[PDB]
Amino acid sequence: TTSAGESADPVTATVENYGGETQVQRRQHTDVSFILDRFVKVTPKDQINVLDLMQTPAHTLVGALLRTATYYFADLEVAVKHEGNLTWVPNGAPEAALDNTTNPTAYHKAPLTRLALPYTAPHRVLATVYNGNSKYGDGTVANVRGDLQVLAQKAARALPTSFNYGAIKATRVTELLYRMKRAETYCPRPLLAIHPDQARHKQKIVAP
Amino acid sequence: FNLDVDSPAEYSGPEGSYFGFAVDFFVPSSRMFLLVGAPKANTTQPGIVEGGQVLKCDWSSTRRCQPIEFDATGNRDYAKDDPLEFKSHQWFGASVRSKQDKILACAPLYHWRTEMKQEREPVGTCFLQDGTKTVEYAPCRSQDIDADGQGFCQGGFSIDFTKADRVLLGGPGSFYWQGQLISDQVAEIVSKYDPNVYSIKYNNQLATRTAQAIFDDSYLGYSVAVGDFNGDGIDDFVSGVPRAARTLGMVYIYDGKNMSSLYNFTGEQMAAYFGFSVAATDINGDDYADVFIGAPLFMDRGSDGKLQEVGQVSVSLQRASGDFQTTKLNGFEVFARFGSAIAPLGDLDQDGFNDIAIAAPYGGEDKKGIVYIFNGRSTGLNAVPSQILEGQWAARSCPPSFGYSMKGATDIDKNGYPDLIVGAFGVDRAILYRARPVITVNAGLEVYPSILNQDNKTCSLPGTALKVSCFNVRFCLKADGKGVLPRKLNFQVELLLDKLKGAIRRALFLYSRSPSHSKNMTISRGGLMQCEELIAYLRDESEFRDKLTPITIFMEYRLDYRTAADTTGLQPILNQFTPANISRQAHILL
Amino acid sequence: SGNTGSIINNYYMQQYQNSMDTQLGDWFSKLASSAFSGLFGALLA
Amino acid sequence: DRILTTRNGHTTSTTQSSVGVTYGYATAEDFVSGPNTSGLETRVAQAERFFKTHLFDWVTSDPFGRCHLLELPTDHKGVYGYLTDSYAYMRNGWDVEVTAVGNQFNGGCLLVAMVPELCSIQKRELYQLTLFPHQFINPRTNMTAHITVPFVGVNRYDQYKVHKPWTLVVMVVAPLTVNSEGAPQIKVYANIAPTNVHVAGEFPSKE
Amino acid sequence: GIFPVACSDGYGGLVTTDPKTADPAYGKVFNPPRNMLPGRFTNFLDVAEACPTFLHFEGDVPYVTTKTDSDRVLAQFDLSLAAKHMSNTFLAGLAQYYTQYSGTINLHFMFTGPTDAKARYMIAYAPPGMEPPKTPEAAAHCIHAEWDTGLNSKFTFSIPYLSAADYTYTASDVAETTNVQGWVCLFQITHGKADGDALVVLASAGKDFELRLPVDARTQ
Ligand SMILES: [Ca+2]
Ligand SMILES: [Mg+2]
């Protein structure tokens, strides 16, 4: 289909333009609420873990596919394998309130304890990248520093802990898993597949 | 001004080991022992070569240098299949400060990995020997790690001992090359250290933490000094900052009681290591320490326009409170770094004040080295030197720099005068210059009567029947000097008459009938003023011509260096600024 | 509705299960459905 | 059949080579009457006019991906930038319009994009800049690109001193290919304008 | 008595993709309102169908340069979503997290030359089974299409989905190196004074493009 090449309105030159017809297409597996509510592993610290969704890795499925959105809204439910007692704390409480048991602890029931948390952020919709990010500010005191203070790729790290779902604290968490349900996404961002060095990225597919 | 340059105590070491980078005295509190640390010598630990050791040279009887290593433990482990410490090429022997029986053999270039990641942080460690106990002191080895910690601290750079048994350590590379001076008593070192614990942390840890942003890369603690600088008796913790204020140089003198700043100084030339080598000692006479700041990389403003790297040492004098007077002491030869080998000498001649030795490493002929001696007086410190020294052996690839490691204020040859351990790491040679016994000689010439009549006619010339004018010459000799040396001083008294008369002399003796007389007068030291009186007459009237020139009697005596050796076999020397010859006059009326 | 697969009603009501949304007083499905197709000029068979 | 002359307030902008205006992410504004401001907002109608700015000089030696990122709002030294130093919380849309005037004998093209919250990009990421509100400019067809976007954001009113939501991005997709009869160097300008600003909360005066 | 049950075996383990929802622990939370907030997408294909994204050619560029010689092959790339040319596309960004697809793939072809340079092109689909064509004479016998550069400067050609099976794998096989899903070839046929001038290409999801069976790429 010949078009106006720069107006950037959507054009879909379908397969009927050179004979033929289109079939019924189903898109349930690419829905944004279906593809995001499954469990993903993140690395835990020893005791205190803020329940930020942007600490999911960038190589995994719903971490690299959550970063497709600029703005997201999703209720989080976690599943954590721990020992001791695990106290969840809402958004913006002091971190000394992790020790108190009036906050929603889960006693140890073997092997793991999954529990559904609400969206406790003050904002209408969370975010992934801030502009300008890391601005006390802009920038605390000096601070420098030396030689690697200028050329550094560590400025895309958020500072306000308001896009967090809260924090969990146990004696020693071993593996804590995120999933995000009722997920709404807004304003898409680019998604990258890895770069082939060959003619085509041939990997060993599964076979009998 | 009494260093034994003729036949000094030669000390050598292994090849390529830099024998003479850190030396110090040691006394088993008799006997004496020298401490010469070689940073690139062969070690007894398997798989580790050129690590470093502390060779103790025996000066008594025969020079017996013995390579000694305190904590000779191998590379420890922490996790699994990973050495916790890397003692390979650790340069063990960069700063070895001792005090009586304690031997502090520090090592700033001691590497140590992080307890959380496989790295290699040079944190430095010290090996202290308290009398007969072997302990390890390393304050820059605990929770602090690389970057925001004490990874590059290199604990054991600027070390010194006080009077209250407090070990003063100073690392310039602490916290992003800022610096930290940790001083801990020996009680916490011998009672608080544990070889099983890797995070050594003492209780009373008096030091300085991080500051603002302009203090970064300042080397806080490049040179340390002890003494009173505020009025409390306890030795303070002087800190040298070579990189202060756009690379100028400031000295931060901290208190040796609760860690508090006292006074601040100002450098002279930009980028000159204003505080590389300091020495706090009395020079004016008030029992107060006086820090003399060194400056190796100083360039004096010459008359030809182009600056010349000669170095500069500032002589500061402390009065009652803290009014330090700065006295600019320029260098000498070009490319000498006058201000690197500065060591107090103390009572070198027992003249009532202390002395100090400042040697130029890269200076001298053929880039060897000249040791400049600075003796004290009543006012302050002398500017001009008193004795010029030279090197002995040659070098290979590293520059010679004769005179780098040296100490003092400790008697070693057993006589009362401390020697000077001139240790040169470039030529791998440590030469010990012994202090010669300074003799305070007091001569005297009493020629009476003063006026001499031409027609006096008093005595009688033997052999003839013609009377002539005569006069009595009574010259006295006296010797007085502290130290262990034979009192029987064999002085060679040379009697000379009429120094002006080139022409025929008019004054001659009677017992010898010759103007020049030779006398061997061996007097005693510390006893009474042994004097001698003789008669000398004048020539006849029909011999001379001029009748207005006074008779200048010139006596020149020289101590015969023969039987003046005892025990150590060292030849004594006379006092400084004291000629061994005198001359008087005798008026002749007309 | 999500990744649920239960025909039974939930046990916990609606407000002890999720966070309730509040009204105040979509795009790319309208953008992808307004796509031009066919041709631009007079076609032949 | 073409109405191709826009205006915002008392300033107009007539272009004769407009391929069309692209409404990004919304055709209409959000509810400006929020509950996080207690009804103390008000529209300033005098902030809606254009203001010109310079971006870069697209020359023939520029390869793929010579991008330019100016954060909106930038330094407005007029009426709009007075509101930044006199009111704490404010929201607005934008309707940008970049111009790359050469002639119809140059070649190449440069993509224009309004992208929210843009920082720390890669040049491998530049292949998918098409996802945002975008509009191509090539001299063979047009001279301008006219993009219009509403207020996006984490929350309804914004503090522009500590946050810049939008980022006008122009990158060069094909390099500028001058010919014997083209124009050697083109200069990229832009006139940006706010849409329906709403301030809330008066600062004290600096005196 | 009480109601007897049988605590059945094999059931009840933790599955990471199950439709079981977790029990709540902290209720009565009212979110701030979010209604009619701009820029919402529902499915990831609508972003991939309404927003085309560039391709990758030799020299890390999206444009292909006209060729002033006897050889007339502008580009010839195999047809897979794990290809080298398709790599920076958003369409192959989310097709890295699935196993198999079906449907058409739109290719958008914008010509960025000056007003005096004219050229015409062709793009053909060579189904698998023999070698891909190297001349526009040989590629006339494919399912091809031609267009020339005039006033409307953009051309959209929908790649047909021809396959034996109903779904084709989005991951090209690691050992099998023949690429038996298909080639797509685009040529130039002629050009008038179009030397050094470009043809920037794009790719979008088709009208009936739909993916299937999500897995975790894990940056592989
Ligand atoms: Ca450097
Ligand atoms: Mg640099």
Residue numbers in the entry:
A (entry chain 1): 1 to 208
B (entry chain A): 1 to 29, 32 to 503, 506 to 594
C (entry chain 4): 15 to 39, 66 to 85
D (entry chain 2): 12 to 218
E (entry chain 3): 1 to 220
From the study:
FMDV, a small non-enveloped RNA virus (genus Aphthovirus, family Picornaviridae), exists as seven antigenically distinct serotypes and many variants and sub-types. Structures of several serotypes determined at near atomic resolution have revealed a capsid composed of 60 copies each of four structural proteins (VP1 to VP4). A prominent feature of this otherwise rather smooth capsid is an exposed flexible loop (∼30 residues) on VP1, termed the GH loop. This loop and the RGD motif embedded within it (residues 145–147 in the O serotype) comprise a major site of neutralization by the host humoral immune response and mediate FMDV binding integrin89101112.
Subsequently, for O1M only, we tested the effect of 2 mM Mn2+. This resulted in more complete decoration of the O1M particles than with Mg2+ and the Mn2+ data were therefore used in further analysis. Although the icosahedrally averaged density for the GH loop and integrin displayed little detail, localized reconstruction enabled us to deconvolute distinct modes of integrin attachment, despite the variable occupancy of the integrin2324. For each virus the two well-resolved classes corresponded to distinct poses of the integrin, for PanAsia these were termed A and A′ and for O1M, A and B. The integrin portion for these complexes was resolved at 10.8 Å (pose A, 4.9% of sub-particles) and 11.5 Å (pose A′, 4.2% of sub-particles) for PanAsia and at 8.6 Å (pose A, 5.9% of sub-particles) and 12.3 Å (pose B, 6.7% of sub-particles) for O1M (resolution assessment uses the ‘gold standard' protocol). The slightly different binding mode on PanAsia (pose A′) shows the integrin ‘moved up' and rotated 12° away from the virus surface whilst the second binding mode on O1M (conformation B) shows the integrin rotated by 158° around the vector normal to the virus surface at the point of attachment, to bring three integrin hybrid, PSI and EGF1 domains together around the icosahedral 3-fold axes. These modes of interaction demonstrate the extreme flexibility in the presentation of the RGD peptide. In each of the structures, the orientation of the VP1 GH-loop is unambiguous. The GH-loop is pulled away from the virus surface, raising the RGD peptide by ∼20 Å above its position in the reduced O1BFS virus where the GH loop packs stably on the virus surface.
